[PDB]
């Protein structure tokens, strides 16, 4: 059996560790959520520059 890298190949990892799906479902919703809270401050910082 050709050993496929579980780190690169996604579904090979889920074949070994099915929890890695939800590990990686988060750290996407989390990063995107942290990313918009980042720009909401920079958008509110400019609202502090003119004010």
């Amino acid at each position: 059996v050709l050993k496929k890298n579980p780190l690169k190949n996604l579904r090979i990892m889920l074949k070994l560790n099915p929890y890695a799906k939800t590990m990686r479902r988060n750290t996407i919703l989390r990063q995107a959520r942290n990313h918009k809270l980042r720009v909401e401050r920079a958008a509110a910082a400019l609202a502090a520059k003119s004010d």
Partner: protein
């Protein structure tokens, strides 16, 4: 200590090693850990039935570390991408041998 370069492996370093370079010694044959049944077929009598079970038994040195660690074939790493400082002398004196405590992780990221 002139011949080895050891340290204290990080959790992530244990993950990448077991996953990318993890081969099991099944029936005295170096067999690639491609699915969990290969582990449970040999380490089932210690409740180690997946890669996570094996990684947990390795990282947090467990009651069955010996059998679990002896199940893994010795990791065949590649040469360190980026070079070495000096192979012949100890790490503290600007070389590479000896105990580089937590810096072993940087060396694993390059060899793995």
């Amino acid at each position: 200590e002139p011949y080895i370069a050891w340290g204290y492996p990080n959790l992530k370093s244990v993950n990448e090693l077991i996953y990318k370079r993890g081969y099991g010694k099944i029936n005295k044959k170096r067999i690639a850990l491609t699915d969990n049944t290969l582990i449970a077929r040999s380490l089932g009598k210690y409740n180690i039935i997946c890669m996570e079970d094996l990684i947990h038994e390795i990282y947090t040195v467990g009651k069955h570390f010996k059998e679990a660690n002896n199940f893994l074939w010795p990791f065949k790493l590649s040469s360190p991408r980026g070079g070495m400082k000096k192979k012949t002398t100890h790490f503290v004196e600007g070389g590479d041998a000896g105990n580089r405590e937590d810096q072993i992780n940087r060396l694993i990221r390059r060899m793995n």
